[PDB]
Amino acid sequence: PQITLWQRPLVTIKIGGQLKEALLDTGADDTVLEEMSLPGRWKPKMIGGIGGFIKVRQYDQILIEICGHKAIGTVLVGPTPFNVIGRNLLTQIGCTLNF
Amino acid sequence: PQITLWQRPLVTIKIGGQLKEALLDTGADDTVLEEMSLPGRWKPKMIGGIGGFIKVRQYDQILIEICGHKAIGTVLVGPTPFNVIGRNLLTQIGCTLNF
Numbered sequence: 001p002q003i004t005l006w007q008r009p010l011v012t013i014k015i016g017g018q019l020k021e022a023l024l025d026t027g028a029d030d031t032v033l034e035e036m037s038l039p040g041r042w043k044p045k046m047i048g049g050i051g052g053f054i055k056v057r058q059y060d061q062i063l064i065e066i067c068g069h070k071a072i073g074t075v076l077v078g079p080t081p082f083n084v085i086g087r088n089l090l091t092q093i094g095c096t097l098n099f
Numbered sequence: 100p101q102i103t104l105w106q107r108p109l110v111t112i113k114i115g116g117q118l119k120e121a122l123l124d125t126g127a128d129d130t131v132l133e134e135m136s137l138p139g140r141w142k143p144k145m146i147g148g149i150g151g152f153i154k155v156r157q158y159d160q161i162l163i164e165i166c167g168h169k170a171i172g173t174v175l176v177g178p179t180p181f182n183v184i185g186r187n188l189l190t191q192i193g194c195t196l197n198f
C-alpha cells in the first residue's frame with residue numbers, strides 16, 4: 001500500500017511462528033529483531049547505529065512475511081530496543097521511497 | 100523522485116550553505132546530523148538508537164534543503180555515525196513508503 005510518515009511506519013511481521021510488530025526503516029542496511037529463537041546455525045556479528053554497537057546473532061536464508069508479503073533473507077537477533085525491518089528485506093517486497 | 104533501496108538512500112542536503120550527504124530514514128522520528136555549528140540557542144535532548152542513548156543539541160526552525168525541496172524544522176546535532184533525515188522532515192517534503 002502507500003505509507004505516509006505522520007506516524008511510525010509500523011507493520012506486523014511473521015517469523016519463527018511468532019507474529020510481531022516492526023518498523024520499516026530505510027536507513028538500516030540490515031534487519032534486526034529483539035531476542036528470539038531461530039532454527040539453524042548463526043554467526044556472531046557486530047552492527048552499529050545511533051548509540052554504538054550491539055552484538056547480534058546472524059541467521060541467513062530466513063523466511064519473513066511482512067504485510068502478507070513473503071521474503072527470505074538475513075536476519076540478526078540481538079539486544080535491539082526495537083524490531084527493525086531493513087533494506088535487506090525491504091527490497092524483496094518492492095518497497096520504494098517517493099516524494 | 101522514486102527511490103529504491105538496493106543502495107543506501109543517500110541524498111544531498113543544503114544546510115547552512117554547505118552541501119552534505121544524508122540518509123533518508125523512515126525509522127527515525129527526528130533528524131540527527133553529524134557535529135556542526137548552527138545559528139541560535141539549542142536545547143538538550145537524549146535520543147535512543149539501536150545501540151544506546153546519546154545526548155544531542157536540539158535546534159529549532161532550521162533551514163534544510165533536501166533534494167531541492169525546502170524544509171524548516173528541528174535538527175538534532177550529535178555524535179551520529181551518519182547524517183540521518185527523519186520523519187519530521189520527510190513528512191515535510193511529502194515522503195511516503197510505497198509497495
Ligand SMILES: CCC[C@@]1(CCc2ccccc2)CC(O)=C([C@@H](CC)c2cccc(NS(=O)(=O)c3ccc(C(F)(F)F)cn3)c2)C(=O)O1
Nearest residue numbers: 027028029030047048049050081082124126127148149181
Ligand atoms: C535515529 C534513531 C533511530 C534508529 C533506531 C530505531 C529505533 C526506532 C524506534 C525505537 C527504537 C529504535 C533507526 C535507524 O535507522 C538506525 C540506524 C543507523 C542510521 C540502524 C538501524 C538498524 C540497524 C543498524 N546496523 S546496520 O549494520 O544495519 C547499519 C549500519 C550503518 C548504516 C548507516 F548507513 F546508517 F550508517 C545503516 N545500517 C543501524 C538507528 O540506529 O537508530
